[PDB]
Amino acid sequence: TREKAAQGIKAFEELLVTKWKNWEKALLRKSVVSDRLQRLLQPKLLKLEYLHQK
DNA sequence: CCATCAGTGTACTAGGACCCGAAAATTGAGTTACAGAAGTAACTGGTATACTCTGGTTTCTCTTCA
After folding, report:
1. CB under 8 Å to A24, separation ≥6 — which residues?
2. Fewer CB within 10 A of the terminal residue: chain A, N end or C end?
3. In strand B, which positions have an atom below 7 A from any protein CB?
């Protein structure tokens, strides 16, 4: 099994494809938006907390 | 006439909740220790909203000088 995996022989569950449902196409958008908000907020939130600590 | 091009008649998926039972885990009582923390169960002040005469007031005729 390890030697087979080393040769890059895809197991059955790796070649297993499933269609992108519509609610997933919505969750993705909402989640990317939320993650970008968090990533942009974290620096400024930390700066604000540091100013408060000083 | 051999190209092309919807429909069709199905088992075979794809999500999509949902259920059925089993097995493991817990709860619960019983004891007896142990220390300390919750968790009510109790008496005992403390200060305000009505409250009840009361002290003053107010004309209104009169009192007392003047």
Report:
1. none
2. C
3. 14-16
Residue A37: Cβ within 10 Å count: 10
Closest nucleotide relative to residue A23's CA, C1' based: B15
> What is the resolution in angstroms?
3.0
Query: Using a 7 Å CB cut-off, which residues contact strand B?
Result: A 18-19, 21, 23
The token pair that represents A2 in the structure block: 């390890």
Q: What is the 3-state secondary structure (H, E, C) of A20-54?
A: CCHHHHHHHHHHHHHHHHHHHHHHHHHHHHHHHHC
Query: What was the elucidation method?
Result: cryo-EM
